[PDB]
Amino acid sequence: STITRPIIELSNTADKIAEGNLEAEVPHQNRADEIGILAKSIERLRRSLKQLADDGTLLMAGVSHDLRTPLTRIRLATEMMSEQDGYLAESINKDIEECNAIIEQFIDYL
Amino acid sequence: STITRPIIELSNTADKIAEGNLEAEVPHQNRADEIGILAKSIERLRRSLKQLADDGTLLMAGVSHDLRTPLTRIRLATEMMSEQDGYLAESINKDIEECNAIIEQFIDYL
């Protein structure tokens, strides 16, 4: 009833987005009827998918960036440790380096 | 029209999913007509969202489980520090807790 064609267009676009084309334009958002309402909802889904994707790609960089602060302060604390505790300072620093290697290496596992 | 009700129902479902209810049930998937085609498309979007959430969650679980080891080693080391270095043991333990909290925060986004 010229509801069929716009509905199939909207469904086709939804399929393409679900399959990975997160920048595809969702049609019919400016329809005045209920298909416009549905199209806006599909655009919300697209925006959520694109957010989760963009976040997944930045996840390791984010984790590394945020952990750097307390890890650096742990290193600072080791630098301040006494001679008696020298062996513990070295052990802890090796643990920090291990955290660094785990983080940097992580992406390699793939 | 005779398909207005299900169109709006599907839009409400899509909104709920986009807002983060990734387990929502998508109605009308087994229909042969326009409604069924749309419903299947919306289910595909839901599945893709859930998969990206699962992917991010898996990666953070991996980061948590790798970092647990060196962070535990640091914790054990602080227990061996001298009394004179107590202030540093306290600082380091606080910073391990910060590491744990950062990881928790990233687990939480998903």
**Determined by which method?**
X-ray
Of A42, A63, A99, the CB nearest to B106: A63
Q: Which 48-107 residues of chain B touch chain A by CB within 8 A?
A: 48-49, 52-53, 55-56, 59-60, 62-63, 66-67, 69-71, 73-74, 77-78, 80-82, 84-85, 88, 91-92, 95-96, 98-99, 102-103, 105-106
Report the C-alpha gap between A52 and B110 in whole angstroms.
9
Structure's resolution in angstroms: 1.2
Count CB atoms within 10 A of the CB of residue A79: 9
User: Helices in A29-81 by DSSP H: which ranges?
Assistant: 34-79
The answer to whether the annotation marks B90 as part of a ligand binding site is no
B36: CB partners within 8 A, 6+ apart? B28, B29, B30
- What is the spatial distance between Cα B107 and Cα B110, in angstroms, rounded to a whole number? 6
Q: From the candidates B22, B34, B47, B58, which should be mutated to test the interface with A, based on the most A CB atoms within 10 A?
A: B34
Nearest to B64 by CA among A19, A84, A52, A59: A59
Per-window interface: B 19-58 vs A, CB < 8 A: 19-20, 34, 37-38, 40-42, 44-49, 52-53, 55-56
Q: What is the CATH number of the domain that holds A59?
A: 1.10.287.130
Give the tokens for residue A43. Answer: 């655009």
Give me the domain span that covers residue B10. Answer: 1-110
CA A109 to each of CA A22, A75, B62: distance values in angstroms, whole numbers, following the listed order? 26, 27, 11
Residue B51, token pair as written in the block: 């998969």
Q: Is B63 strand, coil or helix?
A: helix
List CB contacts of A64: < 8 A, sequence separation 6 or more. A103, A104
Q: Supply B100's token pair.
A: 């744990």
Q: How many structural domains are present in chain A?
A: 1
Of B15, B45, B96, the CB nearest to A18: B45
